[PDB]
Structure formats: C-alpha cells, structure tokens
Amino acid sequence: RPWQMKDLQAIKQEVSQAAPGSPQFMQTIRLAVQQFDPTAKDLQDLLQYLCSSLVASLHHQQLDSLISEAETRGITGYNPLAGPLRVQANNPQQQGLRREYQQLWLAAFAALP
C-alpha cells in the first residue's frame, strides 16, 4: 500500500510555504513516514519531489553521518555481511532496519536549520 500521486501532491502543497525542518514540515513528514511505512527507495523519491538538489545533498550528508554512527555502534537487526543499511531497509523482512532508516531520515532532515 505505497502512497499514490495524490498523497504526495497533498504533502507537498500543505507545506509549500514552510521551510525544511520547520515544526510544521516535521509534523507532516513524520506523519507520512509513520503512516505509509515506506522503504529507503520511496523516501528518496519523496525527498527528490520535495526539496531541491542542494537540500537533497545536505540531507544526504547528514544522514550518512547519522547512519554511520548508528550502525558503527552496532544495531540489533543489522548484519554488515549482507549489504548497506540502504539495501537491508529495502527488504520487506527487515522491518527493524526500515524503522531505524525512517527515524535517521527524519532526524537528519530536521537537523538542517
């Protein structure tokens, strides 16, 4: 049950005025992420739709650092012999990795301003 075009259109329109990482944007994006239960691929699509290449790159770097610390510590469900967290989160049998990816994503995007 992935999102459709209308959901993305509403998500972008409702937060057109606000700035990335504002409390309003964080509310709406967090609700979307917690409601649709998407993988990393869909999150990348959503970010490309919402913010430009500059904000995309900044979030990419911040999320790289956050994932770096998180999975360098060691995580309950992460096994580094199978692939990067971006790929484990895309397997529907690793929901723990998917939820960790979602939370790192939202925190990284909130850490912009």
Residue numbers in the entry: 13 to 125
Task: Quote from the publication.
The retroviral structural protein Gag forms the immature protein shell of nascent virus particles. All retroviral Gag proteins contain three canonical domains: matrix (MA), capsid (CA), consisting of independently folded N-terminal (CA-NTD) and C-terminal (CA-CTD) domains, and nucleocapsid (NC).
To analyze the structure of immature HTLV-1 lattice interfaces in more detail, we engineered an HTLV-1 Gag truncation construct for bacterial expression, purification, in vitro assembly and analysis by cryo-ET. The MA126CANC tubes exhibited varying helical parameters. Tubes were sorted into nine groups and each group was processed separately by subtomogram averaging. The in vitro assembled tubes had the same arrangement of the CA-NTD layer as the full-length HTLV-1 Gag VLPs (Cα root-mean-square deviation (r.m.s.d.) = 1.2 Å), underscoring the biological relevance of our in vitro system. The CA-CTD layer in the tubular arrays was arranged in a similar way as in the VLPs produced from cells, also forming a layer of disconnected dimers. However, in this case, the qualitative difference between CA-NTD and CA-CTD was even more dramatic. The CA-CTD density in different individual tubes did not permit structural analysis other than coarse positioning of the CA-CTD dimer, as the CA-CTD layer was only visible at lower resolution (compare Fig. 2d and Extended Data Fig. 6d). Nevertheless, this allowed us to assess large-scale changes in the CA layer between the different tube geometries. While the distance between the adjacent symmetry-independent CA-NTD trimers was nearly constant (42.1–42.6 Å), the distance between symmetry-independent CA-CTD dimers was skewed such that it was decreased in the direction of tube curvature (31.8 Å) and increased along the tube axis (35.6 Å).
